[PDB]
Amino acid sequence: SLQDAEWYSREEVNEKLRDTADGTFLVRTKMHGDYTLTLRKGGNNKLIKIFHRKYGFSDPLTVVELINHYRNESLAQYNPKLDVLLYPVSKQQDQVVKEDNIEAVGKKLHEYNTQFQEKSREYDRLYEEYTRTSQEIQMKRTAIEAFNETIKIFEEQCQTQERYSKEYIEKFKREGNEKEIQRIMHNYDKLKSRISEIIDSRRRLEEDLKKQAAEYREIDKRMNSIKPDLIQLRKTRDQYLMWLTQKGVRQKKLNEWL
Amino acid sequence: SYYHHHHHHDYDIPTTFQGAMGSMPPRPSSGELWGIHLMPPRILVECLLPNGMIVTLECLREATLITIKHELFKEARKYPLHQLLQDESSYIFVSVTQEAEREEFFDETRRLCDLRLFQPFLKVIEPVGNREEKILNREIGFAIGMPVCEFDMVKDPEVQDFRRNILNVCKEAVDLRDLNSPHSRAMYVYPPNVESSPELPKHIYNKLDKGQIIVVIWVIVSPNNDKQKYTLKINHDCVPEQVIAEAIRKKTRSMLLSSEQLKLCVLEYQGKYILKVCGCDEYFLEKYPLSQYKYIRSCIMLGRMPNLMLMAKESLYSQLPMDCFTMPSYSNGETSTKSLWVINSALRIKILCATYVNVNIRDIDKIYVRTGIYHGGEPLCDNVNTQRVPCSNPRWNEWLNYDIYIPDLPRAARLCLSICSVEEHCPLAWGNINLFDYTDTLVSGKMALNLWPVPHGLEDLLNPIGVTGSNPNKETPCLELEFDWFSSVVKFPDMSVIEEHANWSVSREAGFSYSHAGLSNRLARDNELRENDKEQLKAISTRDPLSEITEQEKDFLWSHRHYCVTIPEILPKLLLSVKWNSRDEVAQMYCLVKDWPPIKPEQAMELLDCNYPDPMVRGFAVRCLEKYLTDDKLSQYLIQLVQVLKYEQYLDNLLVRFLLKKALTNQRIGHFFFWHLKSEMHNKTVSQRFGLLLESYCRACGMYLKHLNRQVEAMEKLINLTDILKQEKKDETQKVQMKFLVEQMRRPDFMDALQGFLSPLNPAHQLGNLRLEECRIMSSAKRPLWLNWENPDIMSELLFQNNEIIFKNGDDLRQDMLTLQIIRIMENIWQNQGLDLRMLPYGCLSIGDCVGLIEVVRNSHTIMQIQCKGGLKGALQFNSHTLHQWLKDKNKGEIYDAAIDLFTRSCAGYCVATFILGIGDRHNSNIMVKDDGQLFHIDFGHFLDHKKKKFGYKRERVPFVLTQDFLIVISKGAQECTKTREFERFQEMCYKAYLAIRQHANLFINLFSMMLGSGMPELQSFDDIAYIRKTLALDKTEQEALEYFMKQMNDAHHGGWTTK
Ligand SMILES: CC(C)(C)OC(=O)N1CCC(N)CC1
Ligand SMILES: CC(C)(C)OC(=O)N1CCC(N)CC1
Ligand SMILES: CC1C(=O)CCCC1=O
Ligand SMILES: CC1C(=O)CCCC1=O
Ligand SMILES: [Cl-]
CATH class of the missing domain: 2.60.40.150 (C2 domain)
Incomplete structure (x- = not known):
């Protein structure tokens, strides 16, 4: 029972404590101390040493005895800023279809891990489209600015000649009027339809920008519906592998399934 | 009956993927004209005249603005209102660029393709903004890649306050340069390339005559052509001045000069020269032992006789142009606001x-x-x-x-x-x-x-x-x-106010009384602590950053916070043991830090990671670096520092001001400081920050802005080029692609932009002409360019006549960048602590978003090539010995013995580093052997076992598994290699190597901690780093670690590892 207490290295503790609630806990050099209560609070892990010579945290020394009491109680009274042992989460035969086959639990571990690894690709795939799309979008916006900025120069250019050209109609006039003003007007007519093209160019980008900005939303939309599946699939896969590592060691046998 | 006749209905092949021809995803970014990578060779450009007339010139892609202006005013005669135009000389071209800003093109030698025009049109105007010199901020915004005017219209006061305040630093650097000019200007440009230690490792020292080297000093006369050797045999630890004298002695001994007359000729001639390295722009400018300069110590190790050159100080001080720093065009609170x-x-x-x-x-x-x-x-x-x-x-x-x-x-x-x-x-x-x-x-x-x-x-x-x-x-x-709005701007209290509250809070502890419930957080011991406690504190000190502290240990640490000053290196642990939610506590920690002992940089770099976001803390951390961190040690750890800027709260901060000053004090540091910042400019987490900082550097760095602008342009050419090879010219034969590559590179804009510049891998090395016949596309699907330049040094011959480096658009280099850097550190750790293991951390640089440069190591082949070449006609099975046979084919005689020693040394080091960093599985096509018998790994892929994301757990992988091939060579050529003294020695290198890197595990943890800042998916959070904690076995004692390592190495090999 002290061995087989439900809740009873640093690194793989944290991967069990990873993504659990405020109040979740478990117990862990020989010279340093003995056992280590690793309590989770709001995303960070508080480690509390159990010294033995009685077992205890420091002064009130009077393993399973010490942990049960606190399960009812807060750790603020022992040490001030620990206003928080509610979740003793260390079961994983709650679900796993209760499968006592062992070999079939191993087959299932592969099944989920394929479904996971399949899901992690599609998630990675969409993260790239997202980031490429963000780039292609802002490149489109910066083009639009330049398109407008270009047109301003061309609008100014069709205006610039109106000053000089229609000073060079009235002065003289008679001197080649039809032979002169034609080829000033031709220039002016080439100039404005060119503006008419550039505007028709920019418009066409903006319609594409909305179709891009549309697709962009759809990437995020489908990312966020692949995330929760990807978490629970991963979390089920940790537990199916825990179930195995409880009963039979077989650390090297795992590699073919995984 | 294969698939139980079960259909997949959704499955569709007809253009269904990233998988099919599965390589190269880095897209996209645009080049020469809007929407197209490379402008047509002949193109129509509208030229908007000041008389309002659109004349449209067909002209060449490659055509200069001088050429185009000239033709415009010849052609503007044929259009009306010609009398309304000035002389062409009274005009400048202007157009809208791809950054959406209207650039005035002042440098009219530039070509139509190189301008980044958005649409192909130019407008003619007389030069507005009469300070034309000032509108060479385009220089800066080309080097940076976003135009300077984009900052000028930023609302944010912080950004604008940054820009004006940071100039303090720039002036101060520029002042430090032009101090002992022309000497200190040369010192900025050409800093001495020097090992951190003058002391020599015992294995280096024994490759001399009890401390003597043969050098070869070179000199020239007329016109240049003939040069004269002067082969000295000086002491290893004599300075350049001394070496220069002895060269002149030998040069100027004569039968017509007496003994005194020689000495009097020596003194006049002596200080008119300094030493250059033959073959690259490197110089020996200050009193360091010759051994300390890195070129010497490389020459010692490689079995080479240095080739230096006597260089006239005035021919050098010729080639330094003046930096001429100019202050830019861009040149508080209501009182009693709040505590x-x-x-x-x-x-x-x-x-x-x-x-x-x-x-x-x-x-x-x-x-x-x-x-x-x-x-x-x-x-x-x-x-x-x-x-x-x-x-x-x-x-x-x-x-x-x-x-x-x-x-x-x-x-x-x-x-x-x-x-x-x-x-x-x-x-x-x-x-x-x-x-x-x-x-x-x-x-x-x-x-x-x-x-x-x-x-x-x-x-x-x-x-x-x-x-x-x-x-x-x-x-x-x-x-x-x-x-929440508190009817006043609330400001954070002054240090003068915190310094008093702390001095009070301390006095209030002195009157708290006897038994205290939760004594835990205060002394009770007074001046006399316990002998058992004072040793438990130094135990905490020694533990790595990832061995998290317990609440007892934290309280404990905090309660003896004043004793902790005796053990400065504890500070990281103490700081994390403060209740930052208690200003009573925090205020005291501000007073501790204020005059806490300086600590070594490798330990003070922990204090600039994300777990230490306080200003007072990170101040002390910089204060450490200002004292200890040498210009050598800074350029080793530069990456980890630039990355760490991301964790600063505000743009203007003491770390930014430290690095910027150093970058402008040292043109080598500057060169990489530029490229690491410039690298991450695509990343919008830092675009603004790094842009602003890069502006400061570029404004202050002097002439090197013009050098960088060239380097910058070389890269852009190459990005644009490969971008086409990877998109339009995919699904074409190598032959067709290669013909496109040469076609393009023969054009004059490419021949301009790619020939005369400095290698970004090492701006010592110049790059002269392109030799296109040795230029080619590699076989990879990413389409890496194999580029080859003629080293235009006077003494090319003496070092390398050809430089060649690989440009690779496609792959995120910055993981390799790191692992290679980690290896470079592991080598220096082993070697300077006396034990010769030869890693070849080949150069790698990321210069953008999955774009970069890798150094080619000449004369080295993949184990695969060794076995392809050495493999018998009838395709059946490759021989294990063919590696060993190939290696004998290179090394013959006493030479053979030494090449195996190298192969046995390099292999032992590359085994240990690999195991520790958990890098990608090694196999015949990513392991390489050099002719001289040095083994080295390439293409590391992921590092900290990042494919443990899929399953993983306690895999603790051995990535370098020594097959027979390797073992044979290690033990000369015997059957059952496993059982020789040659292989006993090997193992003892691996055990002594693994324990060396295990006693520096702090550094390596920390280096990875600081890299979390970059968006490498390999480094997302501290548990990613925690693999290195397991691999080194830091939970255990060294003897248990040794046996753990042996175990781990034994199981992958299946027999070989257990004695001592
Ligand atoms: C000579 C030596 C390799 C020690 O020089 C450096 O410290 N570096 C740092 C990393 C750079 N990419 C290459 C030069
Ligand atoms: C104006 C700009 C800096 C873009 O131009 C260059 O990149 N270069 C290379 C060729 C020139 N003649 C010297 C400077
Ligand atoms: C708070 C502590 C840390 O520094 C990283 C996150 C989890 C931890 O335990
Ligand atoms: C052989 C050719 C190529 O260059 C890539 C694969 C498909 C092709 O047609
Ligand atoms: Cl290489």
């Missing part, structure tokens, strides 16, 4: 509305905003809001109630929040805000916060390592919110 400590209420924050939430209503039930206060770790119970108005128009108008009194907020406090989905908990976006601004002012009002997408590795809801500030991407989840 933050007057505010008598809890913290509360109003969460108003998220706008742009993109979610499946069918999939998700409900959505909510999670929040929390942080300091790296969290000052209070993390809280949420209720699951209101789920999915559609998500609107809560709640005040969240954080149990912390507003005075107890520390200076560096930060709100970290995230919109989530619902036990179906799952983050959607996230974003963090600094609870104070840069002017110390508490945040009060309304803030719109555009959020960041949840990254790959993060499953956690909240992400407080993530960058402080709003996402520049507009069309993303914007969650707007409101902070």
Whole structure:
């Protein structure tokens, strides 16, 4: 029972404590101390040493005895800023279809891990489209600015000649009027339809920008519906592998399934 | 009956992928004209004249603006209103560029393709902005890649305050340069390339005559052509001056000069020369032992006789142009505002509305905003809001109630929040805000916060390592919110006020009485502590940063915080043991830090990671670097420092001011300081920050801005080129592609831009002409270019006549960059601690978004090539010995013995580093052997066992498994290699190597800690780094570690490893 207490290295503790609630806990050099209560609070892990010579945290020394009491109680009274042992989460035969086959639990571990690894690709795939799309979008916006900025120069250019050209109609006039003003007007007519093209160019980008900005939303939309599946699939896969590592060691046998 | 006749109906092959021809994804970014990579060879450009006339010139892609202007005014004769035009000389071209700014093209030698025109048109105008010299900010904005005018119209006062304040640093550097000019100007440009230690390793020292080297000094006369050797045999630790004398002695001994007359000729001639390295721009400019310069110590190890050159100081001081730093065109609070400590209420924050939430209503039930206060770790119970108005128009108008009194907020406090989905908990976006601004002012009002997408590795809801500030991407989840307004701007208290509160808080502990419940957090021992305690503190000190401290140990540490000054190196642990949610505590820690002992940089770099966001802390950390960190040690760790800038709260801060000063003091540091900043410019977490900083550097660095602008242009050419090879010219034969590559490179704009410049891998090495016949595309699917330049040094012959480096658009280099850097450090750790293991950390540089440069090591082949070449006609089975046979084919005689020693040394080092860094599985096509018998790894892929993301767990992988091939060579050529003295020695190298790197595990953990800042998916959070904790076995004692390593090495090999 002290061995087989439900809740009873640093690194793989944290991967069990990873993504659990405020109040979740478990117990862990020989010279340093003995056992280590690793309590989770709001995303960070508080480690509390159990010294033995009685077992205890420091002064009130009077393993399973010490942990049960606190399960009812807060750790603020022992040490001030620990206003928080509610979740003793260390079961994983709650679900796993209760499968006592062992070999079939191993087959299932592969099944989920394929479904996971399949899901992690599609998630990675969409993260790239997202980031490429963000780039292609802002490149489109910066083009639009330049398109407008270009047109301003061309609008100014069709205006610039109106000053000089229609000073060079009235002065003289008679001197080649039809032979002169034609080829000033031709220039002016080439100039404005060119503006008419550039505007028709920019418009066409903006319609594409909305179709891009549309697709962009759809990437995020489908990312966020692949995330929760990807978490629970991963979390089920940790537990199916825990179930195995409880009963039979077989650390090297795992590699073919995984 | 294969598949139980089960159809997959959804499965569709007809153009269905990233998998099919599975390589090269880095796209996209644009080049020569809007929407097209490479402008047509002949193109029509509208030329807008000041008379209003659009004349349209057909002209060549490659055509200079002088050529085009000339032809424009010849052609403008044929159009009307010609009399209205000035002389062509009274005009300048202007157009709209791809950055959407109207650049005036002043340098009219530039070509139509190189201008980045957006649309092909030019406008003619007389030169406005009469200070033309000032509008060579285009220089700066080309080097940076975003135009300087883009900063000028930024509203944000911090940014604008940064720009004006940071100039302090630039003036100070420039002043330090032009101090002992022309000497110190040359010292800036050509800093001595020098090992950190003058002391010599015992194995280096024994490759001499009890401390003597043969050198070869070279000199020239007329015109240049003939040069004369002068082969000295000096002491290893004599300075350049001495070496220069002896060269002149030999040069100027004569039968017509007496003994005295020689000595008097020596003195006049002596200090008119300095030593250059033959073959590259490197110089020996200050009193260092010759051994200390890196070229010498390389020459010693490689069995080479140095080739230096006597260089006239005035022929050098010719080639330095003046830097001429100019101050730019861009050249407080209402009093008694507040002590933050007057505010008598809890913290509360109003969460108003998220706008742009993109979610499946069918999939998700409900959505909510999670929040929390942080300091790296969290000052209070993390809280949420209720699951209101789920999915559609998500609107809560709640005040969240954080149990912390507003005075107890520390200076560096930060709100970290995230919109989530619902036990179906799952983050959607996230974003963090600094609870104070840069002017110390508490945040009060309304803030719109555009959020960041949840990254790959993060499953956690909240992400407080993530960058402080709003996402520049507009069309993303914007969650707007409101902070409490206290009828006055609240400012953070002065250090003068905190220094008093602490001095009081201490006196209030001296009167607290006898038994105290939770004594834990204060002394009781007084001046006389226990002997057992004082040794438990030094035990905590020695433990690595990732061995997290317990609440007892924290309280313990804090209670003896004043004894902890005796053990300076404890500080990292002490700081983390402070209750940052208690200003009583914090104020005291401000006084401790204020005059805490300086510590060694390798330990003070821990203090600049994300777990230490305080200003006073990171001040002390920089204060350490100012004292100890040498210009050598800075350029080793430069990456880890530039990355660490991301974790600073504000643009203007002491670390930024330290590095910027150093970058302008040392043109080698500057060169990489530029490229590492420039590299990450694509990343919008740092675009602004790094742009601004790069502006400062570029304004201050002198002539090197012009050199970088060239380097910059070379890269752009190559990016644009490969970009086409990878898109239009995919599905074409090598032959067809290669013909396109040469075609392009023969054009004059390419021949201009790619020939005369400095290698970004090492700006010592120049790059002269392109030899196109040795230029080619490699076989990889990424289409890496194999580029080859003629080294234009006077003494090319003496070093390398050809330089050649690989440019690779396609792959994120910055993981290799790191692992190679890690190896480079491991080597120097082993070797300077006397044990010769030869790693070849080949050069690698990322210069953008999956774009970079890799150094070619000449004469080295993949184990595969060794076995392809050495493999018998009848394709059946390759011989294990063919490696060994090939190696004998190179090394013959006493030479053979030495090449195996090298292969046995390099292999032992590359085994240990590999195991420790957990790099990608080694196999015949990513392992390489050199002719001289040095083995080295290439293409590392992922590092810290990043494919443990899929399954993983306690895999503790051996990535370099020595097959027979390797073992044979190690033990000369015997049957059952496993059992020789040759292989006994090998093992003892591996055991002594593994324990060397294990006693520096702090450094290596820390280096990886500091790299979290970069968006490498390999380094998402400290548990990613924690693999190195397991591999080195830091939980255990060294003897247990040794046996753990043996075990781990034994099992992969299946027999060989257990004696001692
Ligand atoms: C000579 C030596 C390799 C020690 O020089 C450096 O410290 N570096 C740092 C990393 C750079 N990419 C190459 C030069
Ligand atoms: C104006 C700009 C800096 C873009 O031009 C260059 O990149 N170069 C290379 C050729 C020139 N003649 C010297 C400077
Ligand atoms: C607070 C502590 C840390 O520094 C990283 C996050 C988890 C921890 O235990
Ligand atoms: C052989 C050719 C190529 O260059 C890539 C694969 C498909 C092709 O047609
Ligand atoms: Cl290589």
